[PDB]
Write a protein that binds this DNA or RNA. Structure first.
Ligand code: MG
Ligand code: MG
Ligand code: MG
Ligand code: MG
Ligand code: MG
Ligand code: MG
Ligand code: MG
Ligand code: MG
Ligand code: MG
Ligand code: MG
Ligand code: MG
Ligand code: MG
Ligand code: MG
Ligand code: MG
Ligand code: MG
Ligand code: MG
Ligand code: MG
Ligand code: MG
Ligand code: MG
Ligand code: MG
Ligand code: MG
Ligand code: MG
Ligand code: MG
Ligand code: MG
Ligand code: MG
Ligand code: MG
Ligand code: MG
Ligand code: MG
Ligand code: MG
Ligand code: MG
Ligand code: MG
Ligand code: MG
Ligand code: MG
Ligand code: MG
Ligand code: MG
Ligand code: MG
Ligand code: MG
Ligand code: MG
Ligand code: MG
Ligand code: MG
Ligand code: MG
Ligand code: MG
Ligand code: MG
Ligand code: MG
Ligand code: MG
Ligand code: MG
Ligand code: MG
Ligand code: ZN
Lengths: 208, 151, 138, 237
RNA sequence: UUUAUGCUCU
RNA sequence: GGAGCAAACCGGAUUAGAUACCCGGGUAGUCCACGCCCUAAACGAUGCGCGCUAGGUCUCUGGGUCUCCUGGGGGCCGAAGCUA
RNA sequence: GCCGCGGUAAUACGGAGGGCGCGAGCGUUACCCGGAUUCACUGGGCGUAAAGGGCGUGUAGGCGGCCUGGGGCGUCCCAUGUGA
């Protein structure tokens, strides 16, 4: 299925702290604090003027890695974004963000995108009252994201819900902290998000 | 203030009694992404020296690039030597579609939306000189009417 | 002899503008004027006037060029950068109204003969007709 | 005053080049008799008018003019008429690049200074008898070519050419630099590439002295106080 | 007015 | 029909060989009539017709109010443009 | 796969560590289209790159000067039927 195993090799192969971690990629070691270079035996050697293709590849990998998604799915969406009328570039990002496993992370129900994924695929999530265990369910302006019933306990939740007090969630979102529930209000504008990504190069990638 | 992206570095070689004598050539693009570009081709006995004087000439050859929302006014087709470039304007929200050579230029001059195709000779040197002349020939409804009126 | 009188004209012009002549005579014709007419109305020529060479009907056409430029090759731009027959005698070209061209994204004219006279791309789209597509100019 | 009457322009200043022409010289031609093309002087006036209308303007704003005349008929009539206006000129061979390569051609002028500032000074006699004649010989020719070019340590904003054909190099040389080109030209050359034209005889001292002289005057009038006639009727005929 | 020829891969 | 020339062929030289190059001979053929053959670097390696786009000079051949103009050919240099 | 690697220091062979790309799939072979404006209607050519017929005469065919009417075949417009 989705990728598994070593992650800090990505935190740092793309060469940009991208917070695939929980609280660690925040500590004085996303692994990227200690060793800010590519993994493996050659990470400490002098880089070569990258190939025009290489740059578009690394970028695509970066973004695609952030959401921890499979290329099978990652392009499923890019093609959708292409067809759909819009700015294509930013349209794409909206679709990636509209994912359940991503929302649940943006709403801080869980710390990591991967923690947020297991949370959905276990029943510890509910949409508009219904049980929803599909890390791909696309949410639209108006839905009621929320923690389930039998799941209102579990130190994991309230421990992570607490650390949410102080943090202001992005515009397109909202959260009733005390009640455990958010709402997908709108489709996140480009400006609304500052991904370390140049989405232009990701489009220039699939234009073979 | 300016931006330098070079597309071509190559090693030519003359011939003299006892060995081949080399020399280098660099194609450099110079722009501001605000509507100004320049193409310079410099050659020197070593890579950097040539790259350097490339930019030199690069600014010795500029051009108005009448943008229109990161695109161009009309569609234009231009030929240099046996090489040919087709510039068709795309609607904002598309992207710059071109090869490595025509892209580097169209980018360091603004243009974030444009459709293009190289025809005839895909030779880099000549395709570039053809793309500049292709921009150098663009006209807007403004300069269009400043032509057709009388007096 | 001449197979295409119209094309010939357009070419006579294309050749004068290249050497920057003030004008050029072209064997006259009713239809050949209607077109020459539209070239002045759209400001591609200063206009024309019926004349008589050796007692034969002609049409002096007064060309327009841009201002003397500076730097090497100090030669004016061109009011008529481009002009060529579409529909030829060897291959007639007829387009329905929905099928009308778009010369240089509106920046250029697209003369074309319709059952309501010699019109232009827009001028014809206004009437909403279409017909034989004489030539394109910019 | 400034102007000229078609009276004095009756010496020999209306034609010279027969069927040796440049057909682009249409507007400025009247009729071919005695084989030779006789150039219409009436239009010479109109252009001589419009021409000065740029010279005078340029003069009374401190603009410089560079003189080029390598012909035989138009050599001396420049060395004087130029200095008499405190302007730079070219008398002998026209070194290629002088403008497009002013940067490096000048480095050869600083040498002139450095040679002048070594005539009879605290160091010369210390140098061998062999090198002396040598160093001074490098000066002799050094000044021969760069005498009039010496002035102006910066490229001008116009040049005055005796024959845009004999000096095709310069005309285009400057033309590439956006440097306005003004010249005297008979049927030898073509207009088009001249910015301010003086359509008249470019051979025969008579015309080169008449039209170039009272042209140097119109310069000082916009400068300050036109003097009296200057070196002209030398070995004149 | 006498000459012809130069193994294989770099 | 056949003088000169000359594939083939013979001889003399040359050469390692010399069925070649050079030399001496020499038959078809080269020539004419008639009838076939249909090839070619059959070349400007550039199909034909018509209109349009500076000129300079040399030449052949017409007409001219015979310094020059005009028409049709044959060459060179060349505007603009074309061309790897 | 194409250019090409191996001749005792091989990033090109074999294994290894490491890395890159995809992931219940990953490769391979075969075939179609694309890139190929490389059959060019859009959108190519023919002096020397492949390409002007050895030259004429001419059949069918293709194309065809200026002006004015008639017809309305092409063409254009609208309406409508059909286009499951
Ligand atoms: Mg889109
Ligand atoms: Mg595509
Ligand atoms: Mg071509
Ligand atoms: Mg090719
Ligand atoms: Mg190639
Ligand atoms: Mg042998
Ligand atoms: Mg050998
Ligand atoms: Mg052997
Ligand atoms: Mg081998
Ligand atoms: Mg023998
Ligand atoms: Mg023997
Ligand atoms: Mg023996
Ligand atoms: Mg031999
Ligand atoms: Mg014999
Ligand atoms: Mg014999
Ligand atoms: Mg036989
Ligand atoms: Mg045959
Ligand atoms: Mg022959
Ligand atoms: Mg051939
Ligand atoms: Mg021919
Ligand atoms: Mg034929
Ligand atoms: Mg004759
Ligand atoms: Mg006669
Ligand atoms: Mg002739
Ligand atoms: Mg020639
Ligand atoms: Mg030329
Ligand atoms: Mg070993
Ligand atoms: Mg080894
Ligand atoms: Mg080795
Ligand atoms: Mg390999
Ligand atoms: Mg290996
Ligand atoms: Mg490994
Ligand atoms: Mg491994
Ligand atoms: Mg498979
Ligand atoms: Mg075609
Ligand atoms: Mg081809
Ligand atoms: Mg042809
Ligand atoms: Mg051959
Ligand atoms: Mg032939
Ligand atoms: Mg042939
Ligand atoms: Mg034939
Ligand atoms: Mg025939
Ligand atoms: Mg017939
Ligand atoms: Mg007809
Ligand atoms: Mg017919
Ligand atoms: Mg009729
Ligand atoms: Mg219907
Ligand atoms: Zn980390």
């Amino acid at each position: 299925g989705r990728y598994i195993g070593p992650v800090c090799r990505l935190c740092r192969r793309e060469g940009v702290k991208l917070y695939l971690k929980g609280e660690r990629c925040y500590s004085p070691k996303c692994a990227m604090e200690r060793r800010p270079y590519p993994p493996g035996q050659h990470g400490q050697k002098r880089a070569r003027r990258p190939s025009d293709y290489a740059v578009r590849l690394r970028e695509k990998q970066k973004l695609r890695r952030i959401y921890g998604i499979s290329e099978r799915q990652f392009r499923n969406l890019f093609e959708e974004a292409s067809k759909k009328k819009g700015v294509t570039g930013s349209v794409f990002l909206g679709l990636l963000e509209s994912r359940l496993d991503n929302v649940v992370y943006r709403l801080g129900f869980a710390v990591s995108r991967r923690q947020a994924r297991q949370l959905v695929r276990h029943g510890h999530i509910t949409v508009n009252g219904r049980r929803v265990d599909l890390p791909s369910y696309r949410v639209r302006p108006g839905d009621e994201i929320a923690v389930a019933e039998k799941s209102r306990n579990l130190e994991l939740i309230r421990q992570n819900l607490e650390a949410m007090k102080g943090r202001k969630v992005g515009p397109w979102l909202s959260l009733d902290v005390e009640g455990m529930k958010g709402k997908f209000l709108r489709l996140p504008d480009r400006e609304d998000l500052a991904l370390p990504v140049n989405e232009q190069l990701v489009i220039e990638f699939y234009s073979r | 203030d300016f931006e330098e992206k070079m597309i071509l570095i190559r090693r030519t070689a003359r011939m003299q009694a006892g060995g081949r004598r080399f020399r280098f050539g660099a194609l450099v693009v110079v722009g501001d992404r605000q509507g100004r570009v320049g193409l310079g081709f410099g050659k020197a006995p070593e890579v950097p020296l040539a790259v350097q004087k490339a930019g030199y000439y690069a600014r010795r050859n500029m051009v108005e690039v009448p943008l229109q929302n990161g695109t161009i006014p009309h569609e234009i087709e231009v030929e240099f030597g046996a090489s040919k470039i087709v510039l068709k304007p795309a609607a904002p929200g598309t992207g710059v579609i071109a090869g490595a050579v025509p892209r580097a230029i169209l980018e360091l001059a603004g243009v974030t939306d444009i459709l293009t195709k190289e025809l005839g000779s895909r030779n880099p040197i000549n395709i570039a000189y053809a793309t500049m002349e292709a921009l150098r020939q663009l006209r807007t409804k403004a300069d269009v009417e400043r032509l057709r009126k009388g007096e | 002899m001449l197979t295409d009188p119209i094309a010939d004209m357009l070419t006579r012009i294309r050749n004068a503008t290249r050497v920057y002549k003030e004008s050029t005579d072209v064997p006259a014709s009713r239809f050949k004027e209607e077109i020459l007419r539209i070239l002045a109305r759209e400001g591609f020529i200063k206009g024309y006037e019926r004349v008589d060479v050796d007692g034969k009907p002609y049409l002096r056409v007064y060309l327009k060029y841009g201002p003397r430029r500076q730097g090497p090759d100090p030669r004016p731009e061109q009011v008529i950068h481009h002009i060529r027959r579409i529909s030829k005698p060897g291959r007639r070209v007829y387009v329905g109204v929905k099928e009308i061209p778009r010369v240089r994204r509106g920046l250029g004219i697209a003369i074309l003969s319709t059952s309501k006279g010699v019109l232009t791309d827009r001028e014809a789209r206004k009437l909403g007709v279409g017909g034989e597509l004489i030539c394109e100019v910019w | 005053e400034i102007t000229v009457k078609e009276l004095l322009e009756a010496g020999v200043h209306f034609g010279h080049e027969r069927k040796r022409w440049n057909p682009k010289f249409a507007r400025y031609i009247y009729a071919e008799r005695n084989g030779i093309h006789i150039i219409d002087l009436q239009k010479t006036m109109e252009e001589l008018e419009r021409t000065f209308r740029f010279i005078e303007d340029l003069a009374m704003r401190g603009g410089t003019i560079l003189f080029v005349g390598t012909k035989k008929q138009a050599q001396d009539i420049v060395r004087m008429e130029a200095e008499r206006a405190g302007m730079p000129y070219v008398n002998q061979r026209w070194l290629g690049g002088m403008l497009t390569n002013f940067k490096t051609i000048s480095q050869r002028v600083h040498r002139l200074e450095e040679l002048e500032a070594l005539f009879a000074s605290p160091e010369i006699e210390e140098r061998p008898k062999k090198e002396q004649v040598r160093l001074k010989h490098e000066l002799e020719r050094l000044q021969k070519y760069l005498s009039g070019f010496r002035l102006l340590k910066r490229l001008p904003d116009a040049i005055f050419v005796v024959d845009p054909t004999k000096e095709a190099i310069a005309v285009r040389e400057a033309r590439k630099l956006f440097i306005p080109v003004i010249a005297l030209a008979d049927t030898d050359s073509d207009p088009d590439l001249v910015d301010y034209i003086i359509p008249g005889n470019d051979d025969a001292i008579r015309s080169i002295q008449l039209i170039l002289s009272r042209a140097v005057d119109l310069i000082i009038q916009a400068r300050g106080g036109v003097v009296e006639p200057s070196p002209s009727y030398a070995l004149v005929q």
